[PDB]
């Protein structure tokens, strides 16, 4: 036998619940990178390279 | 017998509530990198990278 | 019997619960990073790295 | 027998409540690094790095 | 019989509760790094580093 | 002026959020009363009576 | 002026969380009374009663 | 002026967060009266009478 | 001025968290009456009465 | 000026956190009562009365 892999679980999310109340919001940018409200993500790479809220104002070369 | 996994859990995320009251929020930016509110988030990777919430303001070369 | 793996759990995260109640709130940022409410996250890395809530001002060269 | 792994937990978080009431908050910036408010977060690594909550104003070179 | 690991518990953190009140906060910052509010997080790492709230002003070389 | 009422809020539920996982319940009864998973419920009453979650064996007369 | 009432909150409930994790649970009941798992309730009376989790076994007369 | 009534709050409950992680539960009862698990509740009462989590065995008359 | 009431709090209950973990509870009863687990509850009441945990075995007449 | 009544507290219960780990619990009754586990409550009461955590094994008339 070569069992090697079952009942397994790699990048997973399940059991979530959120709630937002807000008046007012005023995201606001010049020149740059907002990254908002992320919620509930979940991802698996081999090989390669992973990323979930990234943010990058810029990249001058 | 060659059992080498079994019910494995690797990055994993799964019981998670929240609640979030506000009235104003002002999220401002100029050249620079936000990152806000981020919440019930996993990932696996081989070989690779991992990041989950990265903020850069910039990367001049 | 090689029973290398089983009912392992590498990078979990699994019973969580946040509440905020805010009246006002001022984010702000000129040419700089700002990360901010990060919650309920978890990941696995092979040969590689890791990172979550990672700010950088600027990295010039 | 060669039971090499079993029942193991490496990086994890699971039992977590947080409240926060706040009527202001002025997080500001210029050129700097901020992370703020980071809960309930974990990982593992193999032959790589680990980081969760850094901050760097910047790397000039 | 070669029972090498059972068990374990490596880099963990699992029941926490915490309550705050703030009526105003002024984090504030210019070209330096800040880290505020790190709560509940864990972590494993094989042949590598570990941080979890490390601030560094800049690396000037 | 007689601005007997305003902005009033009497009875009021309006933040919530809940998370429940299970693997088996067996709620099992035998001539009883059960009440069981009651969560976010409001209400008013004038001149006469309430009850949000009332279990009565029985009322023997 | 008689600004008798005004901004007033009269039995409110607003922000809350919560996260259940069991493997099993076996409420179990005869000729009885069983309230289990209540969350978030608000209510006002005039001249009247109240009552949220109210149990009784029985009442013969 | 006859400001009698402002700003008021009169029971209230507002930030709130529990966590609960069991295996097993056997709530078992024989005749008799069970309340268990009561989180974030509020009233008002004009005039009558209150209660919250209220248990009886019975009452024979 | 008869500023009689203003920014008044009566039975208030708001900051407040609870982590529990078990690995079994028997909760058992027998013609009685249990109250268990309650948390975060606030009430008023004019002219009558108020109870919030109350347990009576019974009450025989 | 009558400023009778201003930026009062009465009953009010509101920075708290606990932490509660156990492997057993064996709460266990037979024709009595049991109050268990309180925590967070408050409230006021005009003309009336009040209880907050009050057992009473039975009341025979």
């Known amino acids: 036998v070569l069992y090697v892999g079952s009942?397994?679980?790699?990048?997973?999310?399940?059991?979530?619940?959120?709630?937002?109340?807000?008046t007012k919001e005023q995201v606001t940018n010049?020149?740059?990178?907002?990254?908002?409200?992320?919620?509930?993500?979940?991802q698996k790479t081999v090989e390669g390279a992973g990323s979930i809220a990234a943010a990058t104002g810029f990249v001058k070369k």
Do not use: L
Not at 7 to 22: C, D, I, L
Not at 32 to 38: D, R, S, Y
């Open 30 to 42: 010049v020149g740059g990178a907002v990254v908002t409200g992320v919620t509930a993500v979940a």
């Open 7 to 22: 009942k397994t679980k790699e990048g997973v999310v399940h059991g979530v619940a959120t709630v937002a109340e807000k």
